[PDB]
Design a protein around this ligand. Structure first.
Ligand SMILES: Nc1ncnc2c1ncn2[C@@H]1O[C@H](CSCC[C@H](N)C(=O)O)[C@@H](O)[C@H]1O
Length: 215
């Protein structure tokens, strides 16, 4: 595992991770965390769970990871770990209890559309059976269609129940609910995307897919 703290990366062992995790009730993983504001909120609000967040781009996490590693009085949080990793090559995590993928783009977005099940299966691998998941799709990936969504139509609560659920099941994800999130609900997630989306004139910008990992 490759921990990010400010501009520093430090590899550490699975054994060290296990000792850390063993002190908490459960683990939450944010995949593609970007600037890392969301997991910082999650860790702040959930002191009894260990929050792990990763991104392919280590530079994005510099500021917040440095703050999280500081003393408590300066915004430090003991239950928050930022890692440098892609969704294609996840860290050796096991038994994650809650998985978030918020506003993905690029190969992570292609992955969560499930035309191929490999990425979904790789993410399911780090989770225990019964883990909860939230995939929050940025619908602007279809406004207009970006290269990575190919010919996929923009998903809706109904259409997702139709063509996404079967794909998720093939990959071991039980898609239980699909619904639009109000802009205020998106804002509650505390991602950097709130700012980008503030100027949107669309009714909804995000579709939330939730369920459980069921291999
Ligand atoms: N295959 C992949 N593996 C890991 N991260 C990926 C990825 N493909 C895209 N990403 C990352 O996913 C992020 C999408 S932007 C979303 C950032 C964050 N979830 C937020 O809501 O603010 C980007 O930071 C990008 O670097």
């Amino acid at each position: 595992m490759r921990r990010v703290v400010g501009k520093r990366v430090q590899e550490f062992s699975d054994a060290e991770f296990e000792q850390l995790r063993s002190q908490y009730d459960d683990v939450v993983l944010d995949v593609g965390t970007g600037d890392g504001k969301h997991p910082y909120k999650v860790a702040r609000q959930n002191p009894s769970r260990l929050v792990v967040a990763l991104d392919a781009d280590k530079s994005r996490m510099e500021k917040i990871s440095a703050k999280a590693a500081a003393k408590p009085a300066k915004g430090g949080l003991p239950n928050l770990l930022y890692l440098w990793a892609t969704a294609e090559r996840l860290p050796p995590l096991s038994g994650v209890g809650e998985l978030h993928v918020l506003m993905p783009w690029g190969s992570l977005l292609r992955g969560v559309l499930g035309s191929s099940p490999e990425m979904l299966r790789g993410m399911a691998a780090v989770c225990r059976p019964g883990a909860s998941f939230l995939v929050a799709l940025n619908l602007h990936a279809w406004r207009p269609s970006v290269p990575e969504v190919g010919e996929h139509p923009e998903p809706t609560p109904d259409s997702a129940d139709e063509w996404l659920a079967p794909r998720y099941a093939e990959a071991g994800w039980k898609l239980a609910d699909c619904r639009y999130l109000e802009p205020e609900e998106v804002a509650g997630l505390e991602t950097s995307w709130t700012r980008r989306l503030h100027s949107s004139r669309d009714r909804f910008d995000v579709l939330a897919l939730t369920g459980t990992i069921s291999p």
